[PDB]
Design a protein around this ligand. Structure first.
Ligand SMILES: [Co+2]
Ligand SMILES: [Co+2]
Ligand SMILES: [Co+2]
Ligand SMILES: [Co+2]
Lengths: 327, 320
């Protein structure tokens, strides 16, 4: 019944409309502290984040799950500052993404389990802020290290009850390998979200995972590089599929009877240093609504297509609550 | 004046200086996210204070911590241990072998601005300014490594702060690094070609010293007679004899000596710090306790050894 946020423990009824895969800043370990001028200043980034979260709140958002791990440069102090200023609950993450430094990548599965447990049970750094989710990743076939991370995440989830969420290359069907590794450790599918799943039109892959009890992360809805095909960097990140196509997968999974397995988000950020220089400016031009894209543009889109309000409320409120609750 | 973690110091205050050392070899943000890996931050700090105090009692007055952003440099820890041990510590900027995505995707102009920020403004929100730029290559330089060496040269040219390198001495890296630094217009007197004691080729070292380069004979205690691939198969005496060999060639003023020691090591296998502590119990005190008396026994005078340990580092670190 209680989940950990950057402001402390809250009850699941307080969570409300929740965006399950978001970021305040997409960076690297220690980067924001060492070079805040990359984002203008730390103050400029904080103010931009507060404006965006306040706009999201006005649109209906009550909670966002910041899936930024240590290697994505998660700065919990920044998350706490912006959460309080915008009055939007933010759930922090532990885990490891695809840029682990030497001190992380040379560790055993036992050592990684203890790190994840430290961030969930004790706290992140010296802040006392506890992680409420574990973020892991693969991009195609898992490397020997990525396999250890998935196993460590599963062991950390089994000891705490906190969920696991993933980054995938949906086109390569990564969810199947991830799922197999999680189950080999005894982890329940109901504790896992196979993210970036809206990057494929293969409904057979999505429904099969949904049938096993997995939560499906249709989390990059505003990602579209239509209009900017001359920009190779933006095209590789955002893709050539429209927001409408990504959004119709929510309808397709409801129509197949898997409304309870759907998690929706924007995968948005206010700062982005782990990619090419002016990517944040390009992204803000594509989607000016930012994190508010789901309640403002996606929810009314699905309403006119025939999806009931109680099903949409069930996806945005009930599903994240069941997912985030420690069991 | 040379910038330290406790503020500016004059050239005369530097004294006996170890030019390539580390308080902790880690990764960006690692020490603050998982201090329990080292026992605790308090335990690491206490071990560092004892090791620096031991080096101080052996004659050392200043150490240059060449730990970069990606080696997990924590300047606030460096400042704490420096105060407690009464040893000056010069912090570093630059990039090593483990840059994260936010660093490795940057242009030469952006990396120059980062290095400049750490030298001119300060490191993080501490106000502590770097007094040396650390860079690295393993064999033939990768496209990104070339960008870093160029950004390092440009940061040095705008500030007067020196550049120190990590090399794969067996693959003759110093020659390529030298060509890149020179193409940028950087004076050889502002560059130290480090890890140069890992080779038996004297002709390579003398040729670089003739061009005006400072030779970093900095891994003297490294001997393994995963632990064998890091320390090497050669003895400390063989590495120490290279100092004498370069003095005999008339390049006394071009030599910089150090230990390349640390008190915490997380960027390698789990129990490597314990393995390293058995091999060399002297730690950072290895140079004044074992290397200097060894050289005095081989016929090297005191004024020459004082020239290598006091005069050369002071001239190298002094912003020119
Ligand atoms: Co992702
Ligand atoms: Co994301
Ligand atoms: Co080195
Ligand atoms: Co070193």
């Amino acid at each position: 019944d209680r989940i950990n946020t950057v402001r402390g423990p809250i009850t699941i009824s307080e969570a409300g409309f929740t965006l399950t895969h978001e970021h305040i800043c997409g960076s690297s370990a220690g980067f924001l502290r060492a070079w805040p001028e990359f984002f203008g200043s730390r103050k400029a980034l904080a103010e931009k984040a507060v404006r965006g979260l306040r706009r999201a709140r006005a649109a209906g958002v009550r909670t966002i799950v910041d899936v930024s791990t240590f290697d994505i440069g998660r700065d919990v102090s920044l998350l706490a500052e912006v959460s309080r200023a915008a009055d939007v609950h933010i759930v922090a993450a532990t885990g490891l993404w695809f840029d682990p430094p030497l001190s992380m990548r040379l560790r055993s599965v036992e050592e990684l389990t203890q790190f994840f447990l430290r961030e969930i049970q004790y706290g992140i750094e010296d802040t006392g802020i506890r992680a409420g989710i574990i973020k892991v990743a693969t991009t195609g076939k898992a490397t020997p290290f990525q396999e250890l991370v998935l196993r460590a995440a599963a062991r950390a989830s089994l000891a705490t009850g906190v969920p696991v969420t993933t980054h995938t290359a949906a086109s390569q069907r990564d969810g199947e390998q991830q799922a197999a590794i999680f189950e080999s450790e005894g982890l329940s599918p109901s504790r896992v979200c196979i993210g970036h799943s809206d990057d494929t039109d293969d409904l057979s892959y999505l429904t099969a995972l949904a049938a096993r009890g997995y939560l499906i992360g249709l989390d990059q809805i505003p990602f579209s590089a239509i209009g900017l095909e001359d920009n190779a960097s933006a095209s590789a990140l955002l893709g050539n599929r429209s927001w409408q196509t990504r959004a119709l997968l929510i309808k397709a999974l409801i129509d197949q009877g898997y409304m309870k397995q759907i998690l929706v988000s924007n995968d948005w950020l206010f700062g982005f240093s782990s990619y090419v220089t002016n990517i944040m400016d390009v992204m803000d031009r594509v989607n000016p609504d930012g994190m508010a894209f789901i309640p403002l543009r996606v929810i009314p889109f699905l309403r006119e297509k025939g999806v009931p309000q109680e099903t949409l409320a069930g996806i945005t409120v009930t599903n994240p609550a069941r997912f985030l609750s420690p069991t």
